[PDB]
Amino acid sequence: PGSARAAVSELMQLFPRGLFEDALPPIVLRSQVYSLVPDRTVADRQLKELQEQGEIRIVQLGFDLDAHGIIFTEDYRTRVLKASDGRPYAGAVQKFLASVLPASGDLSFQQDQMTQTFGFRDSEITHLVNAGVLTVRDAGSWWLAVPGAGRFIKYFVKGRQAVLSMVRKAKYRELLLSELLGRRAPVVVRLGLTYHVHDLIGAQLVDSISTTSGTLLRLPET
């Protein structure tokens, strides 16, 4: 009833665009959606509906317990076109965005489909790899990829570890949500405390316990 769409918009607002100088489309992770939409089946169904209505792209990122990213297709398009301006791979990127991206919601593309169905030459596929738009998936396919995602991946994993440590260091390896969110962020946490808390909850790296003091984040040792 708009649940996943509302969750995506709440999480998108947390993304610090300026951290990457606006070079990356804002990214939210599937497990963050589960923090706000705890019925995973409802969340997945509504995300699939958004994918089939053409509004979001699902991207393989590969974090333990939070494998997929979610991006608005128009944010991906406008900025990939922007990251490609005046570069050698601009033509190949434009062809990919105009013809391949609209043709499905898939996370990956087969080599034979790219060459035979869409008419890409090997050199043009190499341009897409150099642009950061494709990465190798297996011997016959490529993942859709986000130019500049490597920096996001490194900041994200370090921040996940640091926020989890804030919980681990607390008494009995548990910390109230209001307490955590009011702490100074460890310097390595670049994407923000709240952004990270939603990943920890949705991935089940912390349990979200309802108490008469509000939400308690508990490391799930048992």
Author numbering: 33 to 254
The authors write:
Serine/threonine protein kinase 19 (STK19) has been reported to phosphorylate and activate oncogenic NRAS to promote melanomagenesis. STK19 binds more strongly to double-stranded DNA and RNA (dsDNA/dsRNA) than to ssDNA.
We determined the 1.32 Å crystal structure of human STK19, containing residues 31-254. The structure of STK19 reveals a compact fold consisting of three winged helix (WH) domains (WH1-WH3) packed together. Notably, the WH3 nucleic acid recognition helix (WH3-H3) is less accessible compared to WH1-H3 and WH2-H3, owing to its proximity to WH1-H2. The STK19 protein in solution is monomeric, as suggested by analytical gel filtration, run in parallel with dimeric Glutathione S-transferase (GST) protein of similar size and with gel filtration standards. This conclusion is also supported by chemical crosslinking using Disuccinimidyl Suberate (DSS). Electrostatic surface analysis of the STK19 structure reveals a large patch of basic residues centered on the WH3-H1 helix. These residues include R183, K186, K190, R192, R200, and K201 of the helix WH3-H1, K203 and R205 in the following loop, and R215, R216, and R222 in the H2-H3 loop of the WH3 domain. Mutations of these conserved residues, namely K186E, R200E/K201E/K203E, and R215E/R216E, abolished dsDNA binding. We selected and purified to homogeneity four STK19 protein variants harboring the patient mutation. Of the investigated mutations, K186N, R200W, and R215W significantly compromised STK19 dsDNA binding ability.
